[model samples]
Target chain A: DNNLSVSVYMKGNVNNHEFEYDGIGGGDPNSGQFSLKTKLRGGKPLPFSYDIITMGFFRAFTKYPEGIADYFKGSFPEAFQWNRRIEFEDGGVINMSSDITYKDKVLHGDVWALGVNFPPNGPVMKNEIVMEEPAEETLTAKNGVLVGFCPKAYLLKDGSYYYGHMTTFYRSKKSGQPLPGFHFIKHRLVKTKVEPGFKMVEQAEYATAHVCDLPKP
Target chain B: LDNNLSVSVYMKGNVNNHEFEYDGIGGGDPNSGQFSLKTKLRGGKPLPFSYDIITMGFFRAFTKYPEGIADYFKGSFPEAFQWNRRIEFEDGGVINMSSDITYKDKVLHGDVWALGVNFPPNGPVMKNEIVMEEPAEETLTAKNGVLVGFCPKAYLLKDGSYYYGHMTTFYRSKKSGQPLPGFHFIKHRLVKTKVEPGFKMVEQAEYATAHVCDLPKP
Candidate 1:
């Protein structure tokens, strides 16, 4: 498999339960447009029985994280979107239908000030940053380069929602490291069946095109 | 220089973060008493100083082993013994590696412990590993010393596929049609080639050959 694409990682708690999701997105890391549909790895490799369905809404968005904060806080960012679905091993499925659009506050930048050094550049962190439970523990003797995704959220077809932040460790505190090490995503999610009185519409708009626009090949 | 003892080593190219290209020659064989070495940058000129072989011995140590000889003692010994040595410069280079040198039926053979890339230099730089010599035995005893090196790995390519290539080099007495001691001569060249789609190679071809001279027989 000859692929030069980068990977994305996200982890947090689903309704206070351990939740993890990872996948290789298609496109150049420097490119603003890319797509991915990865599930929260569970079942078999995971102790849990139900594997969370694919979560890759960022694929539908463009110029993400650049001015994402201003766009979300500006006006109606919601667009023609579909219901989020989940699958269970026991031949069962849950579809979350309904949405509650709201203004999101985000702070984007070199949030950690570790520098924007990625591969083919200088250095990046390689150790795993464990976001277990309350606190996060970095598995490294020293700290170095790091990256942040700002963050994004999603409302599923079922009565659940997900909010996540992605990061890449380009180098360790070891110094002069030239390769991107590990990537991590820290987030929070919850399952609430209560209807937020939000309805699904066929058309809507804000700063740009709909986030769910069909691919224009 | 009474016994006319001398050793030479040539190493070039890159392995991970270290990039070295130099020629080193040492005299006064440790096997005899004391051995000293000096390195030249691409045969340009010898560095300001010289180095000495610090220690030499059987790598893991064979139980029924002979002593009283310097680590460079290259004469016949128990087949169980594997030659190893350490040569550290005053404040410069350090060569502390071992090789498999076996002699039988009048022929001397040696295998170098080589270094190779486990992954490409582009991204996702996996750990580099020591390429061990694949086991091979001769059908008949022959003359001359043979030293071989190889680097085989399934490195990741930018196209997202694993590139499994094995590169090798053989140093033997037949290169020059002359019988030479396999003990002191070394030839290693490591290079990398860039391929499209974020892929790169460290060598021009899969295999190459060479010659190592001068090892005394039993």
Candidate 2:
């Protein structure tokens, strides 16, 4: 009875176009990678279940809103403004703060901007812009955190589906650009299924990882 | 604070074709509705928090075919089954109470069961009459004031006026040495609460204990 057990692991990388282009332009690339580990306890009292064990991700915002727009448009624009913030479903917020440094005539400044993609035409948006903020600040990951549940008991049949909704606000280390942007991410449950030995696997990708054009009117 | 409080019922049980000796009906199957029961006390008393109406679940199976069923059931067709029932809140945090039972018909066999919760963090106090059914009755006598233990043994009467003969045991400590004085060995009936109108009582019996000993001087 004690030999049964199950677990899950998700490891991936986040490649920001801004970071790659900066590295190409004789600048250091600021790429990041993260992984999530979870365990499943199967039997008597608690039965089979998955839990988020640990997670780590690297991040560096080296350019401004225009740089961010360039990454999305594949070319730097003449002028544009950007802002960013990490939000939660319970109205909690965390701002990504970083420091800016310039060298060799290249705009080597630290920038923080929300990464999102809107629906229909797939237009990406970056709202809040902060300069010279401290590094290592925690930003609420998109759509808050995801909790796995028993799919059979809850009627969740697909393995690659999930839904969530949350709101968040941002703050910057720099003044004037005060009260950063605020927005909400509404998610829909898509699919979830049990793997071997009854390990429930699920994925809730955004229908369209959107960046709001303006705060709610 | 009482504005946010509420109550509910939890019950479960199941039925199948084997006749093994068991504590109650259906013989230890998860499908049985007789596994557990509960009554919740929300927003009142000591502080503004929810409390549980709980019933402990117990079961034992005596299989003649522990090593070989063919020899044990030479003359009789043998089968085994179990059932349980429980009441839970929408929030999913609290489990009010529950009941469970298992049985086999071919063995001329059955035993009563006993189970109960402790006080404060683990017990419940009844405060109302939600529902009742056949062979069961509901009244203020069953409601009234605080109830730390509701063992089926205390409620059983010889007059036949009420359903009886089930035994339930409650303790102040897991050691079974100290009984919660003012709240020890209270009897109970198969009273169905309004929270679960369709619930019913199938069978009742008494369990046998090997011994009861006092703890050494502390």
Worst 10 residues of 2 chain A by lDDT: A146-155
Q: After superposition, how far is residue A92 of candidate 1 from its true place, in Å?
A: 47
lDDT of 2 by residue, B16-124 (tens): 1111111222221111112222322222222111111222332222111122211111122123222222322211222222222212333313122222222223212
Candidate 2: tens digits of C-alpha lDDT, residues A160-196: 1111111122222232221211111112222223244
Q: Residue by residue across A1-217, what tens digits does model 1's lDDT show?
A: 1112324344433222344544433432222233333344455232221212223212122223332221211222341122333322122233322221222321111110111212221111211112111101011111332322212222223322222222222222223433222211212222211111111101111112111111110
Q: After superposition, how far is residue A192 of candidate 1 from its true place, in Å?
A: 74
Q: Which regions of candidate 1 deviate over 4 angstroms?
A: A1-217, B43-72, B77-218
Residue-wise C-alpha lDDT for candidate 1, range B65-90, written one tens digit per residue: 12421122233333522433332211
Real A-B contacts recovered, model 1: 0.00
